[PDB]
Design a protein around this nucleic acid. Sequence first.
RNA 1: CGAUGCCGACGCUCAUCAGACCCCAGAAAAGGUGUUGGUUGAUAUAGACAGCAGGAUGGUGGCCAUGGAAGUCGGAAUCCGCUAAGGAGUGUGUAACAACUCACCUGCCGAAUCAACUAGCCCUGAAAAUGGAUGGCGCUGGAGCGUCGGGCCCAUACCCG
RNA 2: CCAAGCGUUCAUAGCGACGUCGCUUUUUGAUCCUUCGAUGUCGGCUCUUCCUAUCAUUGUGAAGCAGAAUUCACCAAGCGUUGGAUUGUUCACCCACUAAUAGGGAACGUGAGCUGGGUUUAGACCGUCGUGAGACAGGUUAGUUUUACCCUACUGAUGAU
Lengths: 131, 190, 52, 199, 51
Amino acid sequence: SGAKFRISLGLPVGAVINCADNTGAKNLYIISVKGIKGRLNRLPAAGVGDMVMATVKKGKPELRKKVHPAVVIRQRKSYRRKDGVFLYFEDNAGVIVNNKGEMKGSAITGPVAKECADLWPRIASNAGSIA
Amino acid sequence: MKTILSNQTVDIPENVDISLKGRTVIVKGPRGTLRRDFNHINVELSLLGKKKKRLRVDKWWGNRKELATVRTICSHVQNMIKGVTLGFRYKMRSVYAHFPINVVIQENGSLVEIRNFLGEKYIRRVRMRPGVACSVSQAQKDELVLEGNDIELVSNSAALIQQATTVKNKDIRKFLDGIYVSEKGTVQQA
Amino acid sequence: IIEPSLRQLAQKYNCDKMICRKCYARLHPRAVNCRKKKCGHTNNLRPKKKVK
Amino acid sequence: QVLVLDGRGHLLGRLAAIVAKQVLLGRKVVVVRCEGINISGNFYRNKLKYLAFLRKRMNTNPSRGPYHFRAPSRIFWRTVRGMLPHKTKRGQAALDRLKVFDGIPPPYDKKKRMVVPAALKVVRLKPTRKFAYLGRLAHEVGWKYQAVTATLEEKRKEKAKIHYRKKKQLMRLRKQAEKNVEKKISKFTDVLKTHGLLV
Amino acid sequence: CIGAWHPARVAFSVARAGQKGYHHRTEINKKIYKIGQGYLIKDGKLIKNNA
RNA sequence: CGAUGCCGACGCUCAUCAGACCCCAGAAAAGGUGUUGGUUGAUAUAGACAGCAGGAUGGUGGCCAUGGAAGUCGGAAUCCGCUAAGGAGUGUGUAACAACUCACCUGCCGAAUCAACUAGCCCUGAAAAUGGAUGGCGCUGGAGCGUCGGGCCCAUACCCG
RNA sequence: CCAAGCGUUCAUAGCGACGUCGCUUUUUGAUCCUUCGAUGUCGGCUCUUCCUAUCAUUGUGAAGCAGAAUUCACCAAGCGUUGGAUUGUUCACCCACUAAUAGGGAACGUGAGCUGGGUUUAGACCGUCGUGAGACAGGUUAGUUUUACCCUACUGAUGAU
Ligand SMILES: [Mg+2]
Ligand SMILES: [Mg+2]
Ligand SMILES: [Mg+2]
Ligand SMILES: [Mg+2]
Ligand SMILES: [Mg+2]
Ligand SMILES: [Mg+2]
Ligand SMILES: [Mg+2]
Ligand SMILES: [Mg+2]
Ligand SMILES: [Mg+2]
Ligand SMILES: [Mg+2]
Ligand SMILES: [Mg+2]
Ligand SMILES: [Mg+2]
Ligand SMILES: [Mg+2]
Ligand SMILES: [Mg+2]
Ligand SMILES: [Mg+2]
Ligand SMILES: [Mg+2]
Ligand SMILES: [Zn+2]
């Protein structure tokens, strides 16, 4: 019921982020972002908690050469919260999901942003820690 | 073609007194008074007789459109007589398949609240025209009774309620819910 | 469910109508010409189709 | 000196045609109550006419004209300007011989107003024809002082009513006085009747 | 491009260089969070804890 | 913008894209229960046209063709009796029953009514890019359209000098 | 526009043959009126504006509209109509997001605004053609993008009556 607030977007289209699950994919290459209408010359951009469409550039062959739905769980660009805290992570990471938002893998490596965890309970249950 | 003369007469009941201020018609009866101005029509109004009064409407040198206005005035004047003697009573039935339509009368019958129409959370509030009173019908369930002396005010009041409960973005041949005018009578049957 | 008498009352206002073939205007059941200028008061009327 | 006209019940273009010819002959004209002026045709088709005018604007700089005046007085003024050769000194001199007012401000409120029977709506229109009111039309295209002008026009009418009652009073005395002095003025009353002055 | 060939003029709606800022502006719906009191000398003591 | 500031004449037309003068500067088919005028044909004081009752059946569910159609769907035929009358049937309804309304008829009240065409004006048909042009303002008891009067305006034309 | 048909039934919910009447100038033509003492020739980029023949959104009418989705029509151009791979491309096609991914004009808007990828000088290669010099709406590679301080318009800045 409580809607997420705007956060700074650090991952335009073309960003290659780490894949932080145990699917087999090493990195995720963002080809688009969900919910972006955009305007002329503006690249769609993604932040923690956003579902994006990505391909695997490095990883298991069965996962390569196709488009997956993924969710960003960490970002290197610092975003403000309503308590005034500017948080950023050591790296940009995501996890492959399906359209329903449930993970394709079962484990997550590293922390998961609170912004994404609140939005995706299936990702939240797998998060070892929350930031 | 212009017609030399076209006229019609109206009989006035004994308990009704009609006075003319030019083309303004004032009808006074047991239930009250109604004044209507006919200055937008170029006719000639005349009161004839003293024991059995009559109202005459004349249209000299009228084309087809102007002749059609002669009876229209007579019918309006007759309705005014009907209003001040018997009054007007429109009844409405509320129709619904699943969701009962709850109607609450406020402000001595001048405000109507409609709730749960097709299950909507929105509350519809319809304001009756002056001189028109709405009331729930103690005789029948899911019925309203609108009463007043002016037919147009009463019937406009009922049109407001009927159009308040309109179905949107559905097949209205299937979703028939609404409050509708079911009868056009008189307050005092006589 | 609706009492069949009340259904007829509702149908008088929602179903018993003629429809202009040129401009789709809702018309009284005894209409012989449309009332809209946009179609030139055409007499190409058809009944409002009945819901099944 | 000045020809004061009352715009109530006059059709816009017929009043302008007569007024324009008058100021071109060197006469000063004042038209008051321009909101009381009328136009033939239903209100709606006359509102569409002004909205069509309202759309005329220099696409590259609207501030350079046309200027769409919203007051019923200025609408009438521009209509008289359209019947004058206003791009010549002779026309501009005439255009300066015309004053236009909404309502009746002083000093014309306490002066007699003339009408133009060749532009009166009761004369020139068939009674079954629709017509528009310049004030209502102006109010619905951006005029802002319809409510105030009506407020001040009602004050004027209240004062004019007291003035009329005073004049009727002074006329009832005038008739009585003529009876009291009837004997002394009978001879002079015969001269006037002999020559048609008194009937 | 500051306009098409026709109209053979630069339109008022095309971006041009000039003054930026120092514009009159009216902004609405700025909530008052606090109406603070000024300093007072009371009993020989400066009372200024308005924060 | 010189001249109708004629007590001009008889009609038509309302346009929420009106109309407005050779060339010429924008419109067609097809439509309208807008309005006007015409042509033809009906029917009406033996009381017409609305409005306000009944009737759905007697042979008979006419026989075919039917999985099944009884007046009710396709194809050729398409009669009688009792009568104020009553199609061997216009429309209601299914996969079949089931069901109803018109044709018809008299009861009422009391002057014109119905239909098909045809032609005027108006309207629909009728969408483009800078804002926009009966020349403009504007004009609707016309300053519009058709038929016509007196009068008046002025070319470097005609007349006299 | 007519309406033979399609649509289980049923011409016209939605379509619609045989015919026929139009509109438009974002296609191509046809013509040769203007410009050959020169109006800078494609496309993109950028930027404003306008049209409606409406894809989305607001309000609506109709469906063979139960709901959901969709289709047809009305008032309607206020606000939107995107990111990319291949191509010089306009066009095209595909990926992806989206409420939607509508269509167009402005000297086929816009080169003293750019860029110069293509076309369209001089160098050079290939194929076909030619004895040849050379040619090719056939490929290929390299090939100078000038001036504003004038007037106006526009943007701001003093000021003037
Ligand atoms: Mg771009
Ligand atoms: Mg303003
Ligand atoms: Mg001579
Ligand atoms: Mg068929
Ligand atoms: Mg030539
Ligand atoms: Mg030639
Ligand atoms: Mg030249
Ligand atoms: Mg040039
Ligand atoms: Mg449109
Ligand atoms: Mg639906
Ligand atoms: Mg060009
Ligand atoms: Mg240029
Ligand atoms: Mg250049
Ligand atoms: Mg090149
Ligand atoms: Mg070369
Ligand atoms: Mg050779
Ligand atoms: Zn219609």
